[PDB]
Ligand binder design. Structure first.
Ligand SMILES: Nc1nc2c(ncn2[C@@H]2O[C@H](COP(=O)(O)OP(=O)(O)OP(=O)(O)O)[C@@H](O)[C@H]2O)c(=O)[nH]1
Ligand SMILES: Nc1nc2c(ncn2[C@@H]2O[C@H](COP(=O)(O)OP(=O)(O)OP(=O)(O)O)[C@@H](O)[C@H]2O)c(=O)[nH]1
Ligand SMILES: Nc1nc2c(ncn2[C@@H]2O[C@H](COP(=O)(O)OP(=O)(O)O)[C@@H](O)[C@H]2O)c(=O)[nH]1
Ligand SMILES: [Mg+2]
Ligand SMILES: [Mg+2]
Lengths: 50, 426, 432, 49, 432
């Protein structure tokens, strides 16, 4: 019985940690694409001004 | 349950404050229309701290925008997140203050603040249990400092057992964008000493130098400077809205940093500012942030902490880190560096950790420090005011609006009292 | 029949309490919903609803909602009673004069009425288990008037106070020496026995024995939760000789002032180490009295021992205990006072220690928990009065405590009692 | 009425709307176990002779 | 052979009757249509027509038509008698003399004609159940001249009265201190038992126990509807120890001028909390005596109890009742008068409580209704004569009364009676 309870509690904690990890993980590539767009905008603005 | 009221006054206050609402709405998941398009159940759990409710699943900020020139808030209303505020909370005049402190306190601001506090009264009575207030201004102008210190003393009498948060930009030595800048700084700090529980010092000179030696910025416009200030404003008050292992609210930071009621001026900072030359090669560890905290370049004022001594230092962490690693790192900074801290206070260093870092960043923290090095910022203002006061230069319209000559001498005596108490406790 | 009441005030008690009730449910076979899956061992800590739900005998009280509202939405939201989770509005914020005089006075009727409702379901009461820490004003100001009311209302009931002690190098607050001297006033007169643990010694034990490079606040509460489970293991399980809460109240405390025992666990080992080591009674007894395993940062070799109580769990044969006891008094390093030859007390239990999900401790057949009362606290209290006197010579941080309702004379009144407590060790430490 | 239902479906996210509807308490189905009809079951300890 | 007559006057008395006669329909299985599907347990309240319809024994009188005209349009149209619903044209308009002197004379011959007609159908009369409120002009004016025609018609019959007490702070009318004094000039003479309920105490019952933050008037009237169905339940059902309507007049009225008891119900709890609790006989009898569950805003610790009547329902047994009653007498907080060594009266029934569908009350096996006669009402009547005296020193609001037939001299005569009635609480409170 102790083995069964330990297994189910481990599964519950693993699922909650997975949720927190994926929600924290999906942030950084958005900022990377944002600054790639910023660099393209800067180059286009310089060429347009010239 | 623990609500804060935000007030924006002056051009410097409004531009910083308008970026502040764009930063925290991204962390809470609010679209510019005002609806909740959020991703977590933890973001909406503590949202009544800064926001009031609307009709139709929308959230409005608990902010009041006040300025004597309508042209400034026309830029704010036309901005990215300008459609979130209440139009009733916009309180404006028609005749500008002219960057003259006697106008914004006696003859021009004295007719508007009847209508300013009625917005403040009905936005602060609607709370269930109010914690404190926030107000953004600068110590160089006649609008940020004229009406800014008047708004504090009217609500300090109204709400005595509360806490004031003023995030003040101090005048710089070498920038000098105003001719009468040493006058109205001394006149405004005469009221911030007696009536504010927490005052922050921010220098435009230091904010420039951070952008070059650390971020390696090419063109640091005024958008990027407010991005540095608004991140420090959010890091201070993150224990109210996010769960943490060792949390510390605003009044928790009121007791530990202020030993005597005269010294509540803090130099703040931010932990993981990094340039993209070395962003992708950087290592992120708790010992790595601690190197970047106590750097005097990372501080946002033109005071060198090695020309003084520290009283109390706190650092509010954000993310998922180990709390043993936090405290032995923050004990090592006190054991080995013993001269720069005071002797009659054991364990100068306080810590706090929350579990929610800012977006797009694994680990982050904010720095707040109390030092005796801040006397030089006050000493350089007191000597610039002394030189012009001998010849009575630029002073004859302040006297023309009902403000006597003895009022300027009273401010200088109270200003030199603050310099003496920093050296006495050194 | 026999049972105990558990109260978790402040923050530092709650995560310890969160790690304790996750430990108690696995030993008694209860899912965290609170219902047994498809025996009177749980009557010490749980109450049986006739439908089939087990309710803990716990009250969770804090002055701020940011720590309890994670339990109302957590995994254990189905376990507690909704009226047991008392919650205020604004935190005392490490100010003793807030949590005792102006903020702790608005929820004292709610917390005490839950004590009456829990003790009216009782049939025979043994004691209380109050969890707090010295540093915070919530764990110091609120505890002081909590136990002032329990002492008057309940006359001769035990009050086993579990307290975190401020370590010399590891500490968070800066007004922390001001609160701990003020915290001592309620423990010298209303507390039957208060247990002392700090954070820094647990940091090294996790760093030295567990080989954990980066310990955190969830790993410390599992080590603390084992000791609280070990003390009450003689109530829920049968053993060779069983110790009640009142049993070891007399055995450990000599005098009406010296009631601060020091907790220790053994063997505190990892999974990669105990698989090779042979562990018997004659080694885990010596590992308790080692100077490198006390869970309070103090040197026991400077002071002298006064009374000890070793509680063994698991597969322990009591002849092997006697060889371990006789070995200790032959050694010259372990020093006792000459007016106490009978200084040990033993307890054997047949229920082995349990593992927790995601934990770092190992599966070891037998484990011993030691409660030691010594004079090593004398340097640990001559330290904390120097921190208080340094900041009080210039009257630092006093204007916050004064304004809430606290006088100035009680700061000097608390210091003169700490002078009386410090000299009580040296009065009784000398051999006649 | 359908547009008011739209408005109330959008407005149900509020803390005040979760804590306090008109003339009722909040939702007790998170508190109680799944699949139990509340008005049909009996709460308490049955006395058996 | 046992019957009761109910009269509902005003708006507060009638609107409870919408929730009162709702509840009696569920218990006996009578549909709101008035026909019973597939037994003399309903003979107290319902008289069966030979066609199959069951009609209530209640008379609904109001001067204002707008509250009865919604009953004549609703689902309960087919239940009541068309002649037992009596309406006027214009209300009393919060005036005493518009209900007793000016308009109440014209329609009272139709009112007593019905009460004469209902009594001839009954073979045994046990009492009356008049529902009204003190504050209004119809609830105060009209019931005062109804009983003085009623007492000269039926002499020895009991007249039980359920009146809404005006709350200390919250009130919805302005001349309530003027209009509540004028009721008691006759109820101290022609009434034998008048129970007290206010609105501010039930507001905090709903806020804390039921967890209802936004209550309406349908929420309160279902809680008051349970107490009346708990008091009457010894007449409709078989029990272990039944109490008649005349039976608890002698138990509760020691002096002719002290007949104002307070009703209390338990366990008033929501449906989420009760699944965690172990509701037993030894605890629901403590829920009545705590000061947070009295249905009148008064502090009972200041006064002393005189006579208590605990009426139980459901699965309760006589051992656990009187084992728990003797527990109360050992407590120092519950203070009885020394001239009543016995004050507890016990009644036990065999039927469990019945919840309405869509209600917020939980489904519990048992229930207890406590009727406490206490001396704490003197402080509740001290503050109301202080409301009268400040408004009479400047002769405010007087000229509306003199324009209808009421004199000014009876304002002095009614006030001097409250000088005597509050005095009599002290003449019986002093110990010999
Ligand atoms: N073992 C353990 N100790 C903790 C934990 N959290 C805080 N502490 C300790 O508690 C001390 C301060 O007391 P706290 O309980 O955190 O604060 P408090 O008593 O709630 O007082 P307030 O913060 O003002 O509400 C710190 O020095 C920490 O060492 C924890 O989760 N586990
Ligand atoms: N609990 C409860 N109290 C009520 C209700 N309606 C009225 N009251 C109380 O009654 C008081 C006013 O007296 P009423 O009985 O309503 O007035 P009235 O007897 O109808 O006199 P008129 O309105 O002129 O016909 C208020 O202070 C309320 O507290 C109700 O539906 N429920
Ligand atoms: N960080 C920041 N500082 C600004 C900005 N605009 C103006 N300032 C500072 O504000 C100072 C002048 O303040 P002033 O305009 O006189 O304040 P006012 O009288 O309240 O409008 C200058 O020294 C600038 O450095 C901005 O957008 N960002
Ligand atoms: Mg806390
Ligand atoms: Mg009416």
């Amino acid at each position: 019985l102790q083995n069964a309870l330990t297994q189910k509690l481990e599964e519950m904690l693993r699922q909650r940690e997975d949720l927190e990890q994926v929600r924290q993980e999906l942030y950084q590539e958005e900022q990377a694409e944002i600054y790639k767009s910023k660099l393209k905008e800067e180059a286009e603005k310089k060429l347009r001004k010239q | 349950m623990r609500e804060i009221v935000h007030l924006q006054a002056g051009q410097c206050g409004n531009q910083i404050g308008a970026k502040f609402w764009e930063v925290i709405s991204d962390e809470h998941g609010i679209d510019p229309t005002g609806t909740y398009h959020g991703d977590s159940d933890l973001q909406l759990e503590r949202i009544n701290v800064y926001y009031n409710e609307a009709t139709g699943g929308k959230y409005v900020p608990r902010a009041v925008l006040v300025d004597l020139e309508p042209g400034t808030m026309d830029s704010v209303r036309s901005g990215p997140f300008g459609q979130i505020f209440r139009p009733d909370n916009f309180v404006f005049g028609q005749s500008g203050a002219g960057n003259n402190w006697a106008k914004g306190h006696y003859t021009e601001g004295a007719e508007l603040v009847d209508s300013v506090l009625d917005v403040v009264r009905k936005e602060a009575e609607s709370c269930d249990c109010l914690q404190g207030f926030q107000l953004t201004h600068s110590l160089g102008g006649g609008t940020g400092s004229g009406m800014g210190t008047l708004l504090i003393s009217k609500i300090r009498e109204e709400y005595p057992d509360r806490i004031m948060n003023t995030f003040s930009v101090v005048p710089s030595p070498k920038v000098s964008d105003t001719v009468v800048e040493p006058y109205n700084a001394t006149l405004s700090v005469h009221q911030l000493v007696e009536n504010t529980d927490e005052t922050y010092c921010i220098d435009n000179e230091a904010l420039y130098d951070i952008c070059f030696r650390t971020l390696k910025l090419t063109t640091p416009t005024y958008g990027d400077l407010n991005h540095l200030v608004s991140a420090t404003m959010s890091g201070v008050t993150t224990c109210l809205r996010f769960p943490g292992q060792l949390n510390a609210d605003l009044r928790k930071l009121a007791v530990n940093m202020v030993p005597f009621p005269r010294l509540h001026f803090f130099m703040p900072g931010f932990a993981p500012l990094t340039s993209r030359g070395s962003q992708q090669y950087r290592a992120l560890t708790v010992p790595e942030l601690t190197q970047q905290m106590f750097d005097a370049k990372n501080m946002m004022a033109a005071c060198d902490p090695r020309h003084g001594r520290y009283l109390t230092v706190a650092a509010v962490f954000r993310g998922r880190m180990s709390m043993k690693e936090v405290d032995e790192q923050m004990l090592n900074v006190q054991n080995k560096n013993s001269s720069y801290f005071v002797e009659w206070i054991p364990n100068n260093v306080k810590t706090a950790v929350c579990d929610i870092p800012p977006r797009g960043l694994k680990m982050s923290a904010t720095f707040i420090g109390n030092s005796t090095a801040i006397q030089e910022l006050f000493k350089r203002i007191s000597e610039q005011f002394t030189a012009m006061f001998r010849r009575k230069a630029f002073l004859h319209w302040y006297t023309g609006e009902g403000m006597d000559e003895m009022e300027f001498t009273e401010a200088e005596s109270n200003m030199n009292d603050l310099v003496s108490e920093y050296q006495q406790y050194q | 029949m026999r049972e105990c009441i558990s109260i978790h005030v402040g923050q530092a008690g709650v995560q310890i309490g969160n790690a304790c009730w996750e430990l108690y449910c696995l030993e008694h076979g209860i899912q965290p919903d609170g219902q047994m899956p498809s025996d009177d061992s749980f009557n010490t800590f749980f109450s049986e609803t006739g439908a089939g739900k087990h309710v803990p005998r716990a009250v969770f009280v804090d002055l701020e909602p940011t720590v309890i509202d994670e339990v109302r939405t957590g995994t254990y939201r189905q376990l507690f009673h909704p009226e047991q989770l008392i919650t205020g509005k604004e935190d005392a914020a490490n100010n003793y004069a807030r949590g005792h005089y102006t903020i702790g006075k608005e929820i004292i009727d709610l917390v005490l009425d839950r004590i009456r409702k829990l003790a009216d379901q009782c049939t025979g009461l043994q004691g209380f288990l109050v969890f707090h820490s010295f540093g915070g004003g919530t764990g110091s100001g609120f505890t002081s008037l909590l136990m002032e009311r329990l002492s008057v209302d309940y006359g001769k009931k035990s009050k086993l106070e579990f307290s975190i002690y401020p370590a010399p190098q590891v500490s968070t607050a800066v007004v922390e020496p001001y609160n701990s001297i003020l915290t001592t006033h309620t423990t010298l007169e209303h507390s039957d026995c208060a247990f002392m643990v700090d954070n820094e010694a647990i940091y090294d034990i996790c760093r030295r024995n567990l080989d954990i490079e980066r310990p955190t606040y969830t790993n410390l509460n599992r080590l603390i939760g084992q000791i609280v489970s070990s003390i009450t293991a003689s109530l829920r399980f049968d053993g060779a000789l069983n110790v009640d809460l009142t049993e070891f109240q007399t055995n450990l405390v000599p005098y009406p002032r010296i009631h601060f025992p020091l907790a220790t666990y053994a063997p505190v080992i990892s999974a990669e180490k105990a698989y090779h080591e042979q562990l018997s009674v004659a080694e885990i007894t010596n590992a308790c009295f080692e100077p490198a395993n006390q869970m309070v940062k103090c040197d026991p070799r400077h002071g002298k021992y006064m009374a000890c109580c070793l509680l063994y769990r698991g597969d322990v044969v009591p002849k092997d205990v006697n060889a371990a006891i006789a070995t200790i008094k032959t050694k010259r390093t372990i020093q006792f006072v000459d007016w106490c030859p009978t200084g040990f007390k033993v307890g054997i239990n047949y229920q082995p220690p349990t593992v927790v999900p995601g934990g770092d401790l190992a599966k070891v057949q037998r484990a011993v928990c030691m409660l030691s009362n010594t004079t090593a606290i004398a340097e640990a209290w001559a330290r904390l009065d120097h921190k208080f006197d340094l900041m009080y010579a210039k009257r630092a941080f006093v204007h916050w405590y004064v304004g809430e309702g606290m006088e100035e004379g009680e700061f000097s009144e608390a210091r003169e009692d700490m002078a009386a407590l410090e000299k009580d060790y040296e009065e009784v430490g000398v051999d006649s | 009425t359908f547009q008011q239902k739209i408005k109330d479906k959008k407005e149900s996210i509020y803390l005040s709307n979760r804590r306090a509807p008109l003339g009722k308490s909040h939702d007790q189905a998170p508190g109680l176990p799944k699949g139990m009809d509340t008005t049909n079951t009996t709460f308490g300890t049955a006395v058996i002779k």
